[PDB]
């Protein structure tokens, strides 16, 4: 999996969904936020 190079910002349960749409944008399976208030993209 990566990060996304496209989002920005922290990541908190606010910000997952968006994680969500901006990998499946990039065309992976989905966001996933970090602990670290981080989004992932999965499917990388």
């Not at 920005?8 to 997952?16: E, R, T």
């Not at 996933?32 to 989004?39: G, R, Y």
Request: aromatic content about 6%; some cysteine; hydrophobic content about 15%.
């Amino acid at each position: 999996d990566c990060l996304s190079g496209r989002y920005k910002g922290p990541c908190a349960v606010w910000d997952n969904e968006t994680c969500r749409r901006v990998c499946k944008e990039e065309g992976r399976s989905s966001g996933h936020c970090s602990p670290s208030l981080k989004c992932w993209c999965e499917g990388c």
